[PDB]
Design a binder for these strands. Structure first.
Lengths: 51, 432, 37, 115
RNA sequence: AUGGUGAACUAUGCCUGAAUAGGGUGAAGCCAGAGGAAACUCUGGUGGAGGCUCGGUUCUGACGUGCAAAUCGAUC
């Protein structure tokens, strides 16, 4: 990362997960997993007919 | 004598293809399994066939003359050809002598191919099939190894733009990263052979053409002029890209050996770091020298005598190689070592331990860090002090003499002759 | 073959109509009433 | 020989992983120095351009989307430094080209005494 | 400073034209003859070719106690 760490004089590196997260921002690729991009439209309002 | 009939059948097929697409496919149908004589007499016979019939333009990127069925014929059959060679030379030492002899002849066929082939995009398979053969901890039963090293050396000698060398050393890096650098020093000599990195520099007899044919000739000449200038610019950029990435590969190979510290490899490591030094980032010169100082200081906590002599000779050779543009711990490195050098019995040793071949042009190529025993390392360190890399120092002249005279008491005969010959040259230099 | 600009555009729009994932308030169309009805 | 094919799965991964742009470099700094954590970037990740299929689609469409799907995030000079330090290769500045650079500037210093 | 008008002032051109002469020596080649076992050389011719001819930066050098009272070696 080219910068120096505050804890120690050694070079501040990045974790595999963070590097994956940066790339997934730049190609947009769904950051928060465990979600469906394509949920069925749950008709929360048309379920009940109007009188 | 079924062999004779098979020899004449294959001979007829050779005379067919050389002078036709189904015949080559039939020749690949010959070598499948279970029949060793057909697996060896035809496989070495297809080599001159491919030597004559391979078009060097990178075939397979997907009218009357088809040139598509012929090229799908050559490529598809060449896949199963080299794939067969893969299954042949993968056989370990615990195998049938027939299968082992098939492996030796297969790598012989492959190394014959590489000198003419490696143009088109089925090269990496053959490169794996020869580098995996070279990169083995035990070589004393393969006669091909020396010759394959020679062919790779020639390959890295003719390669001007760096495409071949980069495609070799990527695969070579993979093998050296899986196996923890168990190499045979001759492979670092083929690393030395890289010429990518260094620079070291009528009117009467005319066939009559039509007006449309002459105008076509003018246009073709102008196209070829553009091809000359464009390929000059492309390869001038390609040389820069290949230098930039090969030097990354070459140096990391070197410094990881300098982690493992194999007793034999260091000589060839510093062969590379002094030849292919001075073409790095010029900020690394101070870093290389600080590494040499570190590798001196490691020996100062106590084989290692060889290593410290190497560090001194390498450093002075590095700065004496700086031809284009315009040293305390190294002279003091010698001034400290001279007791330890003379106190060892291993001053004279031919050094032909695990290295098989003496690489290329050893009469012209002067191995300026590991020339001979250790006697010529003392000679070339002192030569690289008082004749190269200034450091004049009349005080150090008197000090080095007075230590050499407390070294004559601990020397074999030839070494003491050479030392006194250098003292003759110190009487030439410093008359005190 | 070489087609016009607008022909290429409507053919590209046709294949784009198929190959994309579409929101369920659309494609609620094209699931339409059959021939007899 | 299994590791010979299994390590390459990481070697090709860490090419799609490594930073190339200033725009990715800033966000790597913003992580490294404690300004934004994982949780903050996962919020920022939901763009104008999220929830888009990419594998089924023809190339002549995606090559016009990907050119024009770049959100102009603010940069730093601190990031541009490191990304210039990352791209710089080995033969970029040898002894040869240093000596040649001085050979250029000497000719310029001569050309201004030619007048 | 803003807006205009012009430009061989100098480098590199490209297209299309014009001009690129003359006096002298005499290259390659060839012919005849003489030496040379042989190579080759010479004598006499011819032949008409020559950029043929005539109208100051640096070595981080060697000596910052000299090969030098006008320096060497070399680079471009």
């Amino acid at each position: 990362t080219g910068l120096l760490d505050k804890n120690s004089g050694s070079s501040l590196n990045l974790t595999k997960e963070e590097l994956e997260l940066i790339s997934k921002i730049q190609r947009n690729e769904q950051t928060d997993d465990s979600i469906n991009p394509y949920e069925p439209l749950i008709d929360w309002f048309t379920r009940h007919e109007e009188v | 004598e079924k062999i004779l009939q098979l020899k004449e059948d294959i001979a007829d097929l050779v005379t067919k293809v050389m002078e036709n697409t189904a015949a080559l496919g039939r020749l690949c149908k010959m070598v499948e399994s279970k029949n060793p004589n057909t697996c060896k007499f035809s496989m070495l016979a297809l080599v001159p066939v491919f030597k004559s019939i391979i078009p060097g333009y990178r075939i397979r990127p997907l009218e009357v003359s088809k040139l598509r069925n012929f090229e799908q014929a050559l490529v598809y059959n060449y896949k199963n050809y080299v794939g067969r060679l893969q299954s042949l030379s993968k056989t370990p030492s615990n195998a049938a002598p027939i299968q082992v002899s098939l492996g030796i002849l297969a790598t012989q066929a492959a190394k014959e191919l590489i000198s003419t082939a490696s143009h088109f995009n089925f090269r990496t398979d053959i490169f794996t099939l020869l580098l995996r053969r070279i990169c083995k901890p035990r070589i004393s039963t393969d006669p091909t190894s020396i010759q394959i090293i020679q062919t790779f050396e020639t390959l890295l000698n003719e390669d001007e733009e760096g495409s071949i060398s980069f495609e070799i050393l990527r695969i070579f890096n993979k093998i050296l990263k899986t196996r923890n650098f168990n190499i045979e020093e001759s492979v670092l000599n083929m690393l030395l052979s890289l010429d990518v990195l260094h620079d070291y520099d009528k009117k009467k007899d005319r066939v009559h053409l039509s007006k449309k044919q002459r105008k076509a000739r003018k246009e073709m000449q102008q196209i070829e002029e553009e091809m000359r200038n464009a390929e000059q610019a492309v390869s001038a950029e390609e040389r820069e890209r290949n230098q930039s990435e090969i030097l990354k590969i070459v140096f990391t190979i070197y410094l990881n050996i300098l982690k493992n510290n194999a007793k034999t490899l260091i000589g060839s490591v510093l062969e590379g770091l002094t030849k292919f030094g001075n073409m790095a980032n010029f900020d690394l010169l101070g870093d290389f020298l600080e590494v040499m100082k570190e590798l001196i200081s490691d020996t100062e906590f106590d084989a290692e005598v060889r290593k410290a002599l190497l560090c001194i000779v390498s450093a002075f050779s590095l700065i004496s190689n700086t031809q284009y543009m315009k040293l305390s711990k190294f002279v003091d490195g010698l001034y400290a070592l001279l007791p330890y050098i003379c106190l060892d019995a291993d001053i004279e040793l031919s050094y032909r331990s695990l290295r098989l071949a003496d690489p290329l042009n050893n009469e012209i190529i002067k191995p300026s860090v590991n020339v001979s025993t250790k006697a010529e390392l003392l000679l070339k360190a002192l030569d690289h002090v008082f004749f190269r890399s200034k450091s004049g120092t009349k005080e150090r002249a008197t000090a080095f003499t007075k230590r050499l005279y407390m070294c004559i008491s601990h020397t074999p005969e030839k070494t003491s002759i050479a030392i006194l010959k250098f003292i003759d040259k110190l009487m030439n230099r410093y008359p005190e | 073959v070489k087609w016009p600009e607008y022909v290429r555009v409507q053919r590209q729009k046709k294949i784009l109509s198929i190959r994309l994932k579409v929101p369920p308030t659309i494609a609620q169309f094209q699931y339409t009433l059959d021939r007899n009805t | 020989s299994e590791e010979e094919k299994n390590q390459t799965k990481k070697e090709k991964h860490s090419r799609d992983i490594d930073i190339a742009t200033v725009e990715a470099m800033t966000l790597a700094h913003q992580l490294a120095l404690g300004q934004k954590n994982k949780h903050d970037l996962v919020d920022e990740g939901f763009n104008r351009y999220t929830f888009r299929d990419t594998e089924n689609l023809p190339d002549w469409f995606l090559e016009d989307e990907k050119e024009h799907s770049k959100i102009n995030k603010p940069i730093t000079k601190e990031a541009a430094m490191a990304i210039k330090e990352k791209i710089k290769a080995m033969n970029a500045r040898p002894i040869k080209k240093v000596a040649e650079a001085k050979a250029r500037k000497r000719m310029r210093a001569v050309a201004r005494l030619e007048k």
